[PDB]
Amino acid sequence: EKIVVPVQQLDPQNGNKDVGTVEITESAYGLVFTPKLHDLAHGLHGFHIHEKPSCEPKEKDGKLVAGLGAGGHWDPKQTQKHGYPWSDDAHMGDLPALFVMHDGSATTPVLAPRLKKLAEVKGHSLMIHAGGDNHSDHPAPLGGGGPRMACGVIK
Amino acid sequence: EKIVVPVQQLDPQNGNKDVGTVEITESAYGLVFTPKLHDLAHGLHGFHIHEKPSCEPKEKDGKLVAGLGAGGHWDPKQTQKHGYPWSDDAHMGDLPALFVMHDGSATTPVLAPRLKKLAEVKGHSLMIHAGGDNHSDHPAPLGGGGPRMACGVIK
Numbered sequence: 686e687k688i689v690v691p692v693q694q695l696d697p698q699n700g701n702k703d704v705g706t707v708e709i710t711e712s713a714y715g716l717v718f719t720p721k722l723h724d725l726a727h728g729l730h731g732f733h734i735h736e737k738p739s740c741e742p743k744e745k746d747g748k749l750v751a752g753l754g755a756g757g758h759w760d761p762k763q764t765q766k767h768g769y770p771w772s773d774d775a776h777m778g779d780l781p782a783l784f785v786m787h788d789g790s791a792t793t794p795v796l797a798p799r800l801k802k803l804a805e806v807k808g809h810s811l812m813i814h815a816g817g818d819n820h821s822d823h824p825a826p827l828g829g830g831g832p833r834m835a836c837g838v839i840k
Numbered sequence: 841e842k843i844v845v846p847v848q849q850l851d852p853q854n855g856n857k858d859v860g861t862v863e864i865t866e867s868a869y870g871l872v873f874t875p876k877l878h879d880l881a882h883g884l885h886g887f888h889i890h891e892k893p894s895c896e897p898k899e900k901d902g903k904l905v906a907g908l909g910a911g912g913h914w915d916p917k918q919t920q921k922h923g924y925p926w927s928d929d930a931h932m933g934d935l936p937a938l939f940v941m942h943d944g945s946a947t948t949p950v951l952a953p954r955l956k957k958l959a960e961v962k963g964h965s966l967m968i969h970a971g972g973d974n975h976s977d978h979p980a981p982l983g984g985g986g987p988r989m990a991c992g993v994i995k
């Protein structure tokens with residue numbers, strides 16, 4: 686089995702852009718997230734599963750915020766702490782960061798060892814942030830991901 | 841409890857340079873390699889455990905080849921195939937790639953889900969290549985890592 690997650694670059698004002706897919710598969714050691722993305726900003730990006738199966742924007746402080754409809758990091762165990770993908774004190778949605786090369790493409794797979802079966806992740810959203818991920822809530826909350834750059838619904 | 845691996849940039853002609861350490865720790869999901877490196881060439885770099893506890897150069901067909909004293913990828917199960925860290929068909933030494941930022945720093949930890957205890961990696965070497973790693977032997981052997989850029993002995 687695999688899940689093919691369609692991913693859009695988010696722009697609530699001018700309209701989202703299709704940027705490819707991320708394929709989720711089961712390895713013998715956890716779920717593998719294999720990007721097949723194009724036309725994204727180069728850099729190493731925070732990459733997390735968020736709670737709600739939505740990539741819609743939401744209003745906050747008289748501004749429409751991209752991706753905010755996805756809610757927070759997926760946290761079924763209620764750690765209320767952002768962390769490493771191999772830490773049991775981290776949100777279940779915390780994945781290794783996603784690398785976009787200088788040409789805007791992302792093709793480097795990453796493992797989430799705590800996630801074992803595809804059924805676990807259905808009904809949630811897959812988010813790529815503008816910033817990175819130091820896998821801590823310090824010095825910036827949620828790894829320093831910041832704005833939500835691209836998103837797809839996992840189902 | 842950790843192994844602190846001292847790492848040098850390899851240059852047989854001009855002399856090696858000290859570039860920091862990589863710390864190895866146990867997690868509940870395998871060994872974690874946490875780099876604390878500086879002044880390396882930027883890029884996504886192949887990162888593997890090699891067979892021999894040496895970072896010395898070795899002459900091959902009349903050329904002194906940096907790091908060749910380390911031997912090949914550590915392959916105790918004899919897969920004879922370079923692959924993903926989460927595949928049982930891959931060399932045991934196959935790690936996720938090492939990110940070196942433009943400022944020369946490497947600080948992004950990676951997981952080896954098939955390695956469980958610190959003792960298993962002692963007596964080997966930790967290699968960082970000039971090239972990348974597509975975790976295949978095609979289109980280039982050994983993921984396209986090419987030359988050996990930096991190394992430390994795991995003790």
Ligand code: HEM
Pocket residue numbers: 727728729787882883884939940941942
């Ligand atoms: C770990 C994170 C990063 C890695 C591994 C990385 C690596 C690279 C590599 C390998 C290249 C192409 C080789 C070269 O021409 O030098 C490159 C190009 C470049 N990178 Fe990065 N980079 C990272 C993050 C960033 C960030 C955050 C920025 C700035 C937003 C940036 C800006 C650039 C620019 C301007 C180029 C030149 C490509 C061009 O001429 O259009 N990089 N980077």
Ligand SMILES: [Cu+2]
Pocket residue numbers: 731732733734735758812813814830
């Ligand atoms: Cu996120």
Ligand SMILES: [Cu+2]
Pocket residue numbers: 886887888889890913967968969985
């Ligand atoms: Cu190697």
Ligand SMILES: [Zn+2]
Pocket residue numbers: 733758766767768776778779827
């Ligand atoms: Zn998180």
Ligand SMILES: [Zn+2]
Pocket residue numbers: 888913921922923930931933934982
């Ligand atoms: Zn290998």
